Design a protein around this ligand. Sequence first.
Ligand SMILES: *SCCCC(=O)N[C@H](C(=O)N[C@@H](Cc1cccc(O)c1)C(=O)N1CCC[C@@H](C(=O)OC)N1)C(C)C
Ligand SMILES: Nc1nc2c(ncn2[C@@H]2O[C@H](COP(=O)(O)OP(=O)(O)NP(=O)(O)O)[C@@H](O)[C@H]2O)c(=O)[nH]1
Ligand SMILES: [Mg+2]
Lengths: 164, 170
Amino acid sequence: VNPTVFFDIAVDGEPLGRVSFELFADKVPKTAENFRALSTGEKGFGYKGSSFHRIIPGFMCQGGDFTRHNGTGGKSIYGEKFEDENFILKHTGPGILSMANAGPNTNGSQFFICTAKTEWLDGKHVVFGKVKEGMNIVEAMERFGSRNGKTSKKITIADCGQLE
Amino acid sequence: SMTEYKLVVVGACGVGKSALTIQLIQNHFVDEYDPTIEDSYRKQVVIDGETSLLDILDTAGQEEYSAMRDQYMRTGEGFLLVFAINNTKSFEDIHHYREQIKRVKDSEDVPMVLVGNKSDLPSRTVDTKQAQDLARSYGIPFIETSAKTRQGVDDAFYTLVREIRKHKEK
Ligand SMILES: *SCCCC(=O)N[C@H](C(=O)N[C@@H](Cc1cccc(O)c1)C(=O)N1CCC[C@@H](C(=O)OC)N1)C(C)C
Ligand SMILES: Nc1nc2c(ncn2[C@@H]2O[C@H](COP(=O)(O)OP(=O)(O)NP(=O)(O)O)[C@@H](O)[C@H]2O)c(=O)[nH]1
Ligand SMILES: [Mg+2]
């Protein structure tokens, strides 16, 4: 099976709920493996404790900076960055899991979860997974965002790991 | 009641759009880099003896999907075109912003000021003459600034307001 990973989301430390993701290792194996390993922490670093620093309601929730903790940082399991693996999958609607980047071939650890169809990102951001359970938790996270993405409370990955 | 101007600060990633704006608004400079999605500021100023309210839109250096960029170009009255004197790509990007603004506004006569920022730094890659000649080709002023030392900061924004006022006379 494709891997399933989970995030336990917290709001100012209080548990909000669990979001689980299917990672499309069958189509995007290198990008899926990066996110999987960063979710388990097995390389000695990863998502646990990091925050969703940019939440834009009706657009997406972005997180994954566990090095600088401010939205500028990024570290993959392959180095600071890795190339865009492929653009097979598209941003088709809510729940799509895709890589944030600073341009072509700059994948690190930052990622975003779509809360709408975002077709203008197709071919620019590598889609590699989708929310499997807990989309209502992602929807609850949007209350803490704003038009420019600044969050009103600390939305964190309190725990994360691999289910299968 | 006083006149009010919608100003828009555009330019590539990291050229100092926010640092220029925060220096105008708050009179301080931060070395920290906090990338912008969109921020709005307001400030009451006196320019040439005329008191006015400036509505300043600080934009992202990275383009998203244009339809919302066309939005603030549609409503903006004057534009600061910012590059950094140590970032040649940011200077090369300038013509794209001017082209986009003229397209949305359907005019070759839109109030604009070319801003060469980071004029305190010793890593310069863009000659002043290059920027002066570019500004001449566009018929707009060129102002050299440093958000760090505050050099030219008021001048850049106030000159933009003067350009809007002059455009309104025609
Ligand atoms: S001009 C400074 C660019 C810095 C940068 O690219 N940082 C990236 C990052 O966060 N990329 C964003 C794209 C983006 C869009 C607008 C402004 C900036 O600064 C960055 C990204 O991948 N992303 C996911 C898709 C939505 C988009 C967004 O918020 O649009 C409004 N953010 C990090 C990864 C180093
Ligand atoms: N030395 C020097 N550094 C400057 C100057 N203006 C900005 N900087 C620095 O350059 C970096 C980027 O500044 P910032 O204002 O965030 O640039 P921006 O154009 O708003 N970036 P973005 O498009 O992501 O919003 C920061 O480290 C800031 O301190 C300047 O005049 N001199
Ligand atoms: Mg900025």
